[PDB]
């Protein structure tokens, strides 16, 4: 009667060396269903509770109730606290300035240069963005377009320069307007005038939603998305902080996996060298609890002013904007709630805005208590949220704060029987504390921990632990006298990526290859991963080998291609061909690998540049996929592939056809039309964005004229063309009139 228990393997195998078995990433991760309104309310409440002993004010412009815990009473227990102290923060930042002579000045000068150079279109980069013009989320570029358009209609157009800073100027100046005008589509189109207050509340709004597909957690949590007014200001603050973090050896940001690992190793090595043989050394595997909910905009305002000391006032004030806006932020409360009647078999949606005055009879006890606490914070359908940093976004700048505490631990500063150093990456850290005896270690850990509390950093006492230096964890990297592999973290990336036939083949082989190099994917398993990938690709894309008797919508066409091909080894897998891959050729694009084996006609069709399937847009987004790792944010992935008829694009979602927002599809179609024809005059604009104040039309007319002339006096074109063009140009010229 033997019962199998896979955990018993750890009797013999050190946990880190079989750590892969503790990561269940072959199953579907948890998803939220329905509203995030409950989590949002939760967060708003918690953030206020942790700062509750501060001062309340009513904001003159928004009327929002605003809690200020800064320089409040000192923490009295180990609960998460927001009572950060300005003078303590400034001491740490000054200590960091001292430790890095000239670093702040340089990082500032690089930011000034960037401010001058940065184009409005930088803001086209980003994901879902709250769009105050629609009071809805939109893609970043669309949100940018909408803000620009509504601005110009209301008389703000410094951004016509094309420089980002001029758009920022427009943003601040927009807040003076008596009555910002937008247009709704009634449930059609209609002019709406926002009160100065309405507009300002929208400008300061974070949209909120719940985070799906996060691993390692029983319960769901809320996240937030800021709008366009703040985004450009955040851009520059974080650029400044990034410039600094890059020169901090204790910063985990912004370096990636291998480099993060190198830097951790370095810091152990550094530390160990700097210690004496008689010192103990311990490592805290450290997590901060309620990071987002306990950092404070007012503190980041202090950090920015201090970091930029001595700099031009225009730049300082520019950088200070983001913190100020965050101090004055509000959260949208989400989609609301669904209600149901058993007796009457019906169900209904209420809005988050409804929560201001809806009868409370409909709600469970928990939710009703939430609404009651939230009500005092509500303003024009939003909840005031002065404390905290719900949306995050100051990753780099909060990292600077954490590092500043690490930097305090130098022996010449402390002059104690202990000292410390380590690495910081947002709300993960590793702390290395040294001293002569265990009681020095405890004291040093208390010093570090209490200092953290004085600046609103709260070490999770449940998630953190301590041991003698030698082993530790940091962001699911496991160190046992050197980093070990964690193959299971990467398991979700083994599959068909779902970009297209061409991209997916290259992504699939590259994933195997990078895991062989980086995550100790053994060669036997790597071979099996090829076989399993090929099978999944064939089933997904219905591109089973041409000699197989599976029935799909594709099989008859692929069989013809098969029977008509001489060199079958030349056929791409997506064309019913065999798999050519083994370990040695994983880095070779399929098309290259089979090039010499292809029937010339097949190759010639496959690679016909005239084909109507490939969708090229821009050099800078070519051969790029977005992948979502198991942990952390979505990432651009470069792949190597020859553009062929397999480099196609799946269809767009069509749900918008049934909505008020369906007009947008037509506007999109027009703009693309305009941009495509523009590119026929200026091919180079798919590589490097063109610059100019000239209209698109004037630019194209001047190009056509000069091109027709050189065409003529090169021989390429006849006179009875050169006439037709220059004539057509003059008609366009007049029709423009």
């Amino acid at each position: 009667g033997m019962d199998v228990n896979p955990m018993l393997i750890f009797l013999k195998v050190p946990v880190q060396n079989a750590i892969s078995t503790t990561f269940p990433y072959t199953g579907d991760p948890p998803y939220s269903h329905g509203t995030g309104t409950g989590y949002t309310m939760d967060t708003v409440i918690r953030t206020h509770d942790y700062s509750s002993r501060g001062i309340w004010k009513t904001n003159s412009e928004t009327g929002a109730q605003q809690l200020n815990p800064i320089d409040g009473p000192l923490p009295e227990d180990n609960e998460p606290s927001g009572y950060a102290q300005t003078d303590c923060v400034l001491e740490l930042i000054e200590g960091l300035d001292r430790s890095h002579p000239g670093l702040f000045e340089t990082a500032c000068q690089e930011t000034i240069d960037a401010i001058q150079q940065t184009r409005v279109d930088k803001l086209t980069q980003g994901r879902q963005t709250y769009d105050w013009t629609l009071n809805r989320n939109q893609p970043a570029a669309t949100a940018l377009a909408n803000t620009i358009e509504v601005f110009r209609k209301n008389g703000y157009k410094l951004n016509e320069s094309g420089r980002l800073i001029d758009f920022l100027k427009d943003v601040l100046l927009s807040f003076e307007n008596d009555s910002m005008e937008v247009t709704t589509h009634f449930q059609g189109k209609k002019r709406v005038k926002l009160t100065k207050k309405n507009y300002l509340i929208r400008a300061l709004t974070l949209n909120t939603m719940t985070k799906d597909a996060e691993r390692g957690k029983l319960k769901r949590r809320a996240i937030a998305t800021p709008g366009m007014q703040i985004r450009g200001f955040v851009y520059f603050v974080e650029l400044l902080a990034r410039n600094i973090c890059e020169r901090l050896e204790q910063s985990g940001l912004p370096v990636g996996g291998n480099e993060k690992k190198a830097k951790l190793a370095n810091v152990i090595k550094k530390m160990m060298a700097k210690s004496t043989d008689e010192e103990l050394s311990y490592t805290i595997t450290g997590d901060n609890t309620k990071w987002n909910e306990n950092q404070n905009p007012r503190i980041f305002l202090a950090m920015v002013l201090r970091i930029t000391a001595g700099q031009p006032e225009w730049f300082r004030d520019l950088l200070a904007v983001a913190p100020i806006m965050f101090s004055n932020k509000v959260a949208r409360l989400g989609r609301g709630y669904m209600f149901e009647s058993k007796s009457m078999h019906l169900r209904t949606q209420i809005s988050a805005e409804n929560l201001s005055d809806i009868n409370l009879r409909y709600f469970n006890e928990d939710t009703k208590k939430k609404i009651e606490k939230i009500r005092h914070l509500m303003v024009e359908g939003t909840a005031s949220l002065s404390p905290g940093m719900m949306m995050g976004m100051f990753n780099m700048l909060s990292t600077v704060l954490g590092v500043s505490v690490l930097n305090l631990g130098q022996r010449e500063i402390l002059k104690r029987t202990y000292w410390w150093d380590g690495l910081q990456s947002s709300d993960d850290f590793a702390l290395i504390i040294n001293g002569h005896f265990k009681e020095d270690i405890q004291q040093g850990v208390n010093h570090f921990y209490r200092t953290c509390k004085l600046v609103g950093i709260n070490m999770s006492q449940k998630k953190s632990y301590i041991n003698k230096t030698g082993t530790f964890e940091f962001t699911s990297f496991f160190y046992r006298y050197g980093f070990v592999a964690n193959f299971s973290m990467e398991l979700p990336s083994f599959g068909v990526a779902g970009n297209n036939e061409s991209a997916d083949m290259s992504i699939g082989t590259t994933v195997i290859k990078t895991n062989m190099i980086n995550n100790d994917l053994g060669p036997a398993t790597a071979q099996m991963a090829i076989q399993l990938f090929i099978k999944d690709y064939r089933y997904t894309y219905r591109c089973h080998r041409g000699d197989t008797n599976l029935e799909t919508r594709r099989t008859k066409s692929i069989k013809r291609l098969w029977t008509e091909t001489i060199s079958k080894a030349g056929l791409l897998v997506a064309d019913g061909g065999p798999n050519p891959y083994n370990l040695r050729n994983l880095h070779i694009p399929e098309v290259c690998l089979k090039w010499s084996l292809m029937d010339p006609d097949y190759r010639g069709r496959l690679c016909n540049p005239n084909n109507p399937f490939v969708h090229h847009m821009e050099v800078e987004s070519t051969n790029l996929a977005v992948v979502m790792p198991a942990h952390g944010p979505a990432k651009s992935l470069e792949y190597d592939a020859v553009a062929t008829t397999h480099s196609w694009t799946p269809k767009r979602n069509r749900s918008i056809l049934n909505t008020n927002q369906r007009g947008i599809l037509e506007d999109e179609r027009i703009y693309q039309k305009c941009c495509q024809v523009f590119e026929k005059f200026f091919p180079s604009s798919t590589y490097r964005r063109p610059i100019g104040m000239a209209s698109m039309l004037d630019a194209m007319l001047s190009r056509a004229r000069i091109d027709a002339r050189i065409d003529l006096e090169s021989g390429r074109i006849s006179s009875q063309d050169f006439s037709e063009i220059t004539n057509t140009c003059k008609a366009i010229e007049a029709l423009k009139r």
Binding site: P14, K438, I517, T540, N653, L657, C674
Partner: protein, 731 residues
């Protein structure tokens, strides 16, 4: 032509909306509206594709597909529809359309494909003509380094590649700025020629040209050769416990070969200095070593590299040497005098401590060059005076700057406007101070000074400018002419200890001058030698030595008991000696052998782990010493690691739970309260005792007496009861 595009435009401008857009959207603002979309980045593309590939028409294609292929195929499949994709004029089509086209569509010619996609096709060529050696199994530390990932680049910056690609693919859209460099121009010519008449999308051409032209890098765990042609196949050549010997097809860069030759020569020199007969040992290794299966001897015969270690090897082999070194692409030959290496700290203009070596002494330097030459004088961080000549004023510029940098003066130190990369890896100091003052002399020249040179109607001058002046110049800078016999290779001789002298008997090179920097070869070095571990590298010296001890432990143990001094002198421990600082080898040996004798003397206090740990440190004629050691320093890649005498360290620890010795994180297998081999002339008895007085440091055990037991802070926070032994152990 330009015929149909203008007709289209005409057409569009007839429409009022489009005319408004085209007239009121600047070129700048086009960047915004180009990305205007209702479509969002798919958050779960894997799921979505699985869902959509079940559908009849999941693919979106240009509407012109409808005139290009049949609506239905021979089998009745609809291939396209007229449904517009949301937000465009593309239409919804079946995957059957893709296959149709691939069997029955318009055939194109593919002459440009190999050329446009050369970066990719080259990979296949290198593999098709690669050669496989065998697989070996061993544990090797793979250290994470930034490495090159794309062979065949042109080492352009992103600016210079952009400029080149604009000239090649879109010449009329270049704008004002056109190409400086001759490198840019010659690339432009070639590419223009190779890609003329090319009908592949200029998007792909530009994308490929950019990938191919710019040196790109990546941070990777890499144990062997770091050249890009090796990085490219790292997945194939390197595993956790194995190496697949392999040689890519095609030629190595001369730069990679030169770099590897220097690394090989240094390794050979450093290994040889610790042998009883250095010259014999160096010659042996020279004669067995190969780089990519080329004999080192042939390389040394035909390679012009002038470097100290390289020149020692050349001397040994009867090859004539140029007694010069290169710095910043210019060959330097010291005429008279000499100087001294000194490690000292330096506050730069950035406000930065950066403590690398200085040269301190009188040194006349003749400096040859591409198009220039000069007669630099140098004291201690001094430019005593540099007279420079060349074809162009330009060629006098490069070298002008190089020489101010090379001087090490305070006026260039306190004139810069970090010392590590982001991974916090130390960088080349007296090469980076050049790189900086390269693209920005400005501060240097206006912080250098000037001088009022006499009429002496011959010696011109250069100003804080680049300008030429009559009887002024920079501080110690001149512009004259002069400078065949600089390049002449001389016959030298070399003694048993690697000292190189000319035929007149004058000392040219000594092994101690050889740079101590432990680099990483770009190409594979095989020493093929009994004097070198099969697995290269300093980390591997550590793991291999301890692995070897452990696996031979039965023999080595009885040798330890019966015949110590033969064990100490074994040749397998000589590589390890190269990791021990020269100045510590003897004292460390003395300490170790004494501890081992105490272990022998005090019976029943045997400890195999302690013996294994300390054994390599025995391998040097011992010196007498009072000093007690709590650790021994090893130098691994420029960084001291300390191995603790008592118990476990990060470098060497025994793990009870696995029952293995772990060395720099790698298992190398496994083999009373009284500790006999930790302090010389003391025993550790066990836990400290307050009933034997207060706690002394180690360096205060000084004045105890036979039998007299103390409490000691012995290491890593422990306090123990020691006793000064009654008898002694001698060596």
């Amino acid at each position: 032509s330009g015929m149909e595009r203008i007709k289209e435009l005409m057409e569009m401008v007839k429409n009022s909306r489009m005319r408004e857009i085209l007239t009121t959207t600047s070129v700048d603002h086009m960047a915004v509206i180009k990305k205007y979309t209702s479509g969002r980045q798919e958050k779960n593309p894997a799921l979505r594709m699985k869902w959509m590939m079940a559908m009849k028409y999941p693919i979106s294609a240009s509407s012109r597909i409808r005139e290009m292929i049949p609506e239905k195929d021979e089998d009745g499949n609809t291939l396209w529809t007229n449904t517009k994709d949301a937000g465009s004029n593309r239409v919804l089509v079946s995957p059957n359309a893709v296959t149709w086209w691939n069997r029955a569509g318009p055939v194109s010619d593919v002459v440009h494909y190999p050329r446009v996609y050369k970066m990719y096709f080259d990979r296949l060529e290198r593999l098709t003509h690669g050669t496989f050696g065998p697989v070996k199994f061993y544990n090797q530390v793979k250290v994470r380094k930034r490495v090159d990932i794309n062979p065949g680049h042109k080492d352009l910056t992103s600016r210079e590649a952009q400029e080149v690609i604009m000239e090649v693919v879109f010449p009329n859209e270049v704008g004002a700025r056109t190409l400086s460099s001759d490198a840019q121009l010659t690339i432009t010519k070639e590419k223009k020629e190779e890609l003329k008449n090319c009908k592949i999308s200029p998007i792909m051409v530009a994308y490929m040209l950019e990938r191919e032209l710019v040196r790109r890098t990546r941070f990777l765990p890499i144990a062997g050769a770091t050249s890009s042609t090796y990085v490219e196949v790292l997945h194939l050549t390197q595993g956790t416990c194995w190496e697949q010997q392999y040689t890519p097809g095609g030629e190595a860069e001369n730069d990679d070969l030169d770099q590897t030759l220097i690394i090989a020569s240094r390794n050979i020199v450093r290994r040889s200095i610790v042998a009883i007969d250095p010259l014999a040992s160096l010659l042996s290794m020279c004669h067995t070593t190969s780089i990519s299966s080329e004999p080192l001897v042939e390389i040394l015969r035909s390679n012009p590299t002038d470097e100290q270690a390289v020149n020692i090897c050349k001397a040994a082999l009867g090859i004539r040497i140029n007694n010069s070194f290169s710095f910043g692409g210019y060959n330097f030959k010291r005429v008279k005098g000499s100087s001294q290496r000194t490690e000292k700290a330096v506050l730069t203009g950035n406000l930065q401590t950066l403590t690398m070596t200085i040269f301190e002494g009188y040194e006349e330097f003749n400096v040859s060059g591409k198009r220039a030459s000069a007669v630099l004088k140098k004291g201690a961080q001094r430019l005593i005076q540099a007279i420079i000549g060349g074809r162009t004023l330009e060629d006098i510029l490069n070298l002008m700057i190089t020489l101010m940098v090379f001087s090490q003066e305070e006026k260039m130190l306190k004139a810069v406007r970090n010392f590590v990369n982001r991974a916090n890896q130390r960088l080349n100091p007296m090469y980076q101070l050049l790189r900086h003052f390269q693209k920005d002399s400005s501060t240097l020249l206006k912080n250098w000074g000037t001088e009022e040179i006499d009429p002496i109607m011959g010696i011109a001058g250069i100003m804080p400018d680049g300008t030429i002046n009559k009887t002024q110049t920079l501080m110690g800078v001149r512009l004259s002419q002069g400078g065949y016999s600089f390049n002449e290779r001389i016959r030298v001789n070399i003694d048993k200890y690697l000292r190189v002298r000319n035929e007149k008997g004058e000392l040219l090179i000594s092994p101690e001058e050889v740079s101590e920097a432990q680099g990483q070869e770009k190409l594979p070095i095989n020493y093929n030698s009994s004097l070198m571990w099969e697995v290269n590298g300093p980390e591997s010296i550590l793991t291999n030595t301890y692995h070897w001890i452990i696996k031979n432990w039965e023999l080595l143990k009885t040798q330890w008991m019966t015949d110590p001094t033969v064990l100490y002198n074994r040749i397998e421990f000589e590589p390890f000696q190269t990791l021990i600082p020269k100045g510590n080898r003897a004292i460390y040996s003395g300490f170790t052998r004494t501890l081992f004798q105490q272990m022998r003397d005090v019976e029943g206090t045997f400890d195999s782990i302690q013996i294994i740990k300390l054994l390599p440190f025995s391998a040097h004629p011992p010196s007498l010493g009072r000093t007690q050691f709590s650790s021994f320093t090893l130098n691994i890649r420029g960084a001291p690691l300390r191995l603790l005498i008592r118990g476990n360290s990060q470098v060497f620890n025994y793990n009870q739970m696995e029952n293995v010795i772990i060395v720099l994180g790698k298992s190398v297998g496994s083999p009373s309260s009284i500790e006999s081999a930790v302090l010389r002339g003391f025993l550790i008895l066990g836990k400290a005792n307050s009933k034997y007085g207060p706690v002394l440091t180690i360096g205060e055990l000084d004045k105890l007496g036979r039998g007299e037991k103390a409490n000691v802070l012995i290491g890593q926070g422990d306090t123990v009861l020691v006793m000064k032994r009654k008898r002694d152990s001698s060596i």
